[PDB]
Amino acid sequence: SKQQIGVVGMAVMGRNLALNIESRGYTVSIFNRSREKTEEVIAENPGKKLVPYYTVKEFVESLETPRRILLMVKAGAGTDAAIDSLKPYLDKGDIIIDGGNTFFQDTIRRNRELSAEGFNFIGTGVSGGEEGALKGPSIMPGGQKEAYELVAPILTKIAAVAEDGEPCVTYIGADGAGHYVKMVHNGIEYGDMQLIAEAYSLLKGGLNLTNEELAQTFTEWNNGELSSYLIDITKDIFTKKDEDGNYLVDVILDEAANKGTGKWTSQSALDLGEPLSLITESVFARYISSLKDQRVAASKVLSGPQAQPAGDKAEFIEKVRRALYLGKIVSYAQGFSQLRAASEEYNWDLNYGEIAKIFRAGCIIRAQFLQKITDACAENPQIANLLLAPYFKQIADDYQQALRDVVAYAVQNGIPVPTFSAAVAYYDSYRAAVLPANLIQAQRDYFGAHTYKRIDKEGVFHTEW
């Protein structure tokens, strides 16, 4: 008896995906380069249809052809070592699926090299954390279309499901398109977290809300248009008490770590010519949080204002709420515009509405908000920027003054609001028919003879200034 799919890598993510697959009725082969972890998975999951293998050869031979092998191992050398360990036993047409958080260019390279050896390769993002991997993640696969069609029945069964019942998996595109989309999802997640962090700074610093008041605030926001997994868990965090009866969030060291996808999304915006200011400022905010020794030293030297009178409490809370929602809109408009630039550069012909649809559940950024994006893409598939969609244009019309008031209040109060500030600058720059780049171009021609174009005549010009 052979299995339809096998999982290599029994750390928590691989183990949980194996259990998710097993829960849909499949018998699953499992293997780990270290036998101990495999033994542990078997001991902890009695009665489950997991079949453990202890050599790569036997693991590969246990699979029906074309083989479907899901790799959940360490990124980098561990992924190439896993692939190389499987190669001698594979047949032409077999399919290797890398579900790690791999940089997309590495997937493009692996896909091309393996294709020349006769093997298919699907690089797929998996979002949702350990719980999502076990119960229903958002899955973002890229690679050969026919290989995707051969694994789609399994992926659709294990994926999270949206409100309308659609599985949160779709064929993203060729080669590294799936890992590129996972990277952008992580960039967007960084932005959403930083936007929420600024809302917290404003509420605590401007109104002095207690943690119970913050939890109540985020609870109410989660009942409206901002409904999202990140806002929902934030209300839980502000409720959590530590032993001494005090809140846990207040003793956590304020140094935000990262595993690359945030930095990668911004480096890609820079390569592509995309103005991804919000997510990039979110990466820089984690970086400055990690310079805690310098911040503490600076705090003893540098001066600034203190919080200004906030005015009516309910009114201030509603302005921050509006600022947060419009800030999200701007961040996603920048991210989806980057998906378009990437699609063009890497020749993926991405379907933006289908991408938004699989972000409606399973992934970390899940929110009803993704349905508004799905809707905008449905009505205009090649929309250049989400800000132009009717729903978003109307929210900007109605909420921009609150965002402006929040930023002006924060700047006068000494409260840092990098992403709310970036949201306003982007909105005011994108809608400006004329920007001061005319002076920049004049300067470049003056000092470096770089030439410029004119608004009233075709051609390139150089002036002897």
Is 57 labelled a binding residue?
Answer: no
**Measuring CA to CA, which residue among 124, 164, 136 is closest to residue 357?**
164
Contact call for residue 57 and its own copies (CB under 8 A): no
Contact 46, 22 (CB under 8 A): no
Q: Please give the helix or strand (H or E) that residue 411 lies within, else none.
A: helix 390-413
138-142: strand order across its sheet: 50-52, 28-31, 5-8, 68-71, 95-98, 120-127, 138-142
In the set 37, 58, 163, 189, the catalytic residue is 189
119 vs 264, beta carbon nearer ligand 6PG: 264
Cα–Cα distance for residue pair 188/201, rounded to 1 Å = 20
**Which residue's CB is nearer to ligand 6PG, number 101 or number 234?**
101
Q: How many CB atoms are closer than 10 A to CB 211?
A: 18
Nearest to 330 by CA among 424, 229, 397, 200: 424
Is 2 labelled as part of a ligand binding site? no
Q: Which is nearer to its own copies, 194 or 374 (CB)?
A: 194
Whether residue 185 is annotated as binding a ligand: the answer is yes
Q: For its own copies, give the closer residue by CB, 49 or 444.
A: 444
| Residue 259 annotated as binding site | yes
Q: Which does 186 bind (CB under 5 to 8 A by kind): ligand 6PG, its own copies, none?
A: ligand 6PG
Residue 73, annotated as binding a ligand: yes
Binding-site size, its own copies (CB under 8 A): 117
Residues between 181 and 200 with contacts to its own copies, criterion CB under 8 A: 193-194, 196-198, 200
Residue 25 assigned ligand-binding role: no
One character per residue 286-305, x = contact with its own copies (rule: CB under 8 A): xxxxxx--xxxxxx-xxxxx
How far apart are CB 262 and ligand 6PG at their closest, in Å?
5
101 binds, among its own copies, ligand 6PG, none (CB under 5 to 8 A by kind): ligand 6PG
Stretch that binds its own copies, among 89-97, 135-143, 220-228, 271-279 (CB under 8 A): 271-279
Q: Which residue has the tokens 């920048």?
A: 334
Would you call 64 a catalytic residue per the annotation? no
Report the residue number, 128 or 136, with the smaller CB distance to ligand 6PG: 128
CA distances from 57 to 11, 49, 89 (A): 20, 20, 6
Question: Is residue 206 a known part of a binding site?
Answer: no
The residue behind tokens 């092998």 is 69
Which long-range contacts does 314-320 make (Cβ < 8 Å, 24+ apart)? 316/202, 316/206, 316/207, 317/203, 317/207, 317/217, 318/402, 319/402, 319/405, 319/406, 320/199, 320/202, 320/203, 320/402, 320/406
- Name 123's bridge partners: 98, 142
Tell me how far apart the alpha carbons of residues 156 and 179 are, in angstroms, rounded to a whole number.
18
121, containing H or E segment: strand 120-127
Candidate residues 39, 40, 80, 130; the one interacting with its own copies per rule CB under 8 A = 130
- Binding flags for its own copies, 144-173, as an x/- string (CB under 8 A): ------------------------------
204 labelled catalytic: no
Contact by Cβ (8 Å): 336, 373? yes
Which entry of its own copies, ligand 6PG, none binds 412, CB below 5 to 8 A by partner kind? its own copies
Residues within window 204-263 making contact with its own copies, judged by CB under 8 A: 229-230, 233-234, 236-237, 240, 242, 248-257, 263
State the residue for tokens 């999951």. Answer: 45
Residue 246 carries which DSSP code?
A: S
48 binding partner (options ligand 6PG, its own copies, none; Cβ < 5 to 8 Å by kind): none
Nearer to its own copies among residue 219 and residue 267 (C-beta): 267
Total Cβ atoms within 10 A of residue 5: 22
Binding residues for NADP(+): 9-14, 32-34, 73-75, 101
Binding residues: 9-14, 32-34, 73-75, 101, 127-129, 185-186, 190, 259, 286, 444, 450
- Residues taking part in catalysis: 182, 189
